[PDB]
Amino acid sequence: SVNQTPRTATKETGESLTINCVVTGARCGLSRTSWFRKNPGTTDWERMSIGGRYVESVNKGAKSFSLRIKDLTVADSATYICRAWSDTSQKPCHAWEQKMWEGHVDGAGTVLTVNQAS
Amino acid sequence: NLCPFGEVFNATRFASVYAWNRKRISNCVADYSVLYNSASFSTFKCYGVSPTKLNDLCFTNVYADSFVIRGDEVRQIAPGQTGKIADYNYKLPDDFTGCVIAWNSNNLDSKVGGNYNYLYRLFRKSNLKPFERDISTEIYQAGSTPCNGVEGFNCYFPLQSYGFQPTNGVGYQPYRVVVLSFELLHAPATVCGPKK
Ligand SMILES: *[C@@H]1O[C@H](CO[C@@H]2O[C@@H](C)[C@@H](O)[C@@H](O)[C@@H]2O)[C@@H](O[C@@H]2O[C@H](CO)[C@@H](O)[C@H](O)[C@H]2NC(C)=O)[C@H](O)[C@H]1NC(C)=O
């Protein structure tokens, strides 16, 4: 499972949002992360490309990771989801008797509202 | 000869969790990479097996159990969990070998004014054994007085409707769930990945 915080947020234009995702029960290490945004009413999630206003940080040892969205706009109002992978490619794995998982799972989402400027 | 995972994941109707459906999958080739790499599944958790290696493994049989629960409860479909769902509706064994696959189905399973066709069991005299299925509707005797089939004080009808509506919060929205059990017996294999 992934504990994603904050579940909701309201920001002014120009502020930033930090989303934290903590991965629990992963048999192995964190082998991949992705971020998706969903606009209300649409069918598909949109994969987010890191490197501009989207900046990611990964704490491999804590099996946690975060995203910061800079320079918020009303166009950024949306729901945001983190997705975490864990599989045997990441070397330190727990035994199977521990009832831990390999695979991928999503956080429960951050509903971001950005208010207009002025 | 490809395993009919379509009939399972794309079934038009899904079962209530208390009355969960099981489909035996046998004598076929299973390409799990399409499922594992799909963006549609918000949970894809495997126990006792690495999903990146599934296309290289064979199993005696595979079982595909499917049902609907609410988002908050998908975490109960795991070895070693407790709660209403794990205790009284669908239980995985501690030594489970397989994968739990879930996706949000608000667009299909919620209705304006409420969809009441999906139910869950709220009470039971004992916890389910792994993979046990209980579809009885006996009045639950919560106290010392017998119920005689009448609801009342300490005497409860055992099933409740979810009531899914589209405006529900995510934790209350319906999720479809498929549990793949990878059975290994001392016998020839009938379900293999494409790499055999
Ligand atoms: C479950 O169905 C999806 C999509 O179903 C499509 O729409 C239906 C109305 C029906 O006409 C199907 O035959 C359609 O494919 C499957 O995803 C598709 O997979 C094919 C395989 O190459 C691909 O070309 C399509 O683009 C996919 N469409 C989408 C929307 O993803 C999916 O494979 C099915 N699941 C299983 C387990 O079989």
**CA B28, CA B181: separation in Å to the nearest integer?**
15
**CA A57, CA A49: separation in Å to the nearest integer?**
14
B131 lines ligand 1 (CB under 6 A): no
- CA-nearest of B141, B146, B101 to B124 is B141
**CA B28, CA B190: separation in Å to the nearest integer?**
7
DSSP-derived secondary structure letter, A116:
P
Find out whether A110 and A48 touch, Cβ atoms under 8 Å. no
Q: What are A8's strand-pairing partners?
A: A111
- CA-nearest of A91, A110, A116, A118 to A9 is A110
CB-based contact, A87 to chain B, within 8 Å: yes
**CA B135, CA B132: separation in Å to the nearest integer?**
10
Q: Mark whether B146 and B109 lie in a shared domain.
A: no
Q: Mark whether B80 and B151 lie in a shared domain.
A: no
Q: Mark whether B141 and B175 lie in a shared domain.
A: no
Number of domains in chain B: 2
Report how far apart the first and last C-alpha atoms of chain B are (Å, whole number).
Answer: 12
* Helix, strand counts (H, E) of chain B: 4, 12
- For an interface test with B, give the residue of A97, A101, A110, A111 to mutate (most B CBs within 10 A): A101
Q: Mark whether B67 and B158 lie in a shared domain.
A: no
B39 lines ligand 1 (CB under 6 A): no
Of A47, A81, A99, the CB nearest to B80: A99
At CB < 8 Å, which residues of chain B contact A?
Answer: 36, 39, 41-53, 71, 75, 78-80, 94, 96, 99, 107, 170-171
B113 lines ligand 1 (CB under 6 A): no
Q: Mark whether B101 and B119 lie in a shared domain.
A: no
* Domain of B151, in residue numbers: 114-165
Q: Mark whether B45 and B136 lie in a shared domain.
A: no
Q: Mark whether B41 and B86 lie in a shared domain.
A: yes
- CA-nearest of B3, B64, B52, B56 to B29 is B3
**CA B165, CA B158: separation in Å to the nearest integer?**
22
Distances (CA, A) of B86 to A100, B78, B147: 16, 8, 26
Q: Mark whether B33 and B122 lie in a shared domain.
A: no
CA-proximal residue: ligand 1, atom 10 (nearest): B10
Distances (CA, A) of B170 to A38, B38, B67: 13, 21, 18
Strands of A17-23's sheet in order across = A2-5, A17-23, A64-69, A54-59
Find out whether A57 and A118 touch, Cβ atoms under 8 Å. no
Residue for token digits 């799972």?
A105
Looking at chain B, list the stretches that DSSP marks H as alpha helix, in order from N- to C-terminal side: 5-9, 33-36, 84-88, 106-109
Backbone angles phi, psi at B189, to 5 degrees: -85, 140
Q: Mark whether B58 and B131 lie in a shared domain.
A: no
Q: Per the CB < 8 Å rule, is B52 touching A89? A: yes
Cis peptide upstream of residue B174 (ω within 30 degrees of 0): no
Provide the experimental method for this PDB entry: X-ray
Residue type, A21: C
Spatial CB neighbours of A22, under 8 Å, sequence gap ≥ 6: A2, A3, A62, A63, A64
Find out whether A83 and A45 touch, Cβ atoms under 8 Å. no
Backbone angles phi, psi at B56, to 5 degrees: -105, 5
What are the residue ranges spanned by the domains of chain A?
1-118
Of A43, A45, A103, the CB nearest to B99: A103
Taking CA–CA distances from A89, the nearest residue in chain B reads B52
Q: Are strands A8-12 and A110-115 parallel, antiparallel or unpaired?
A: parallel
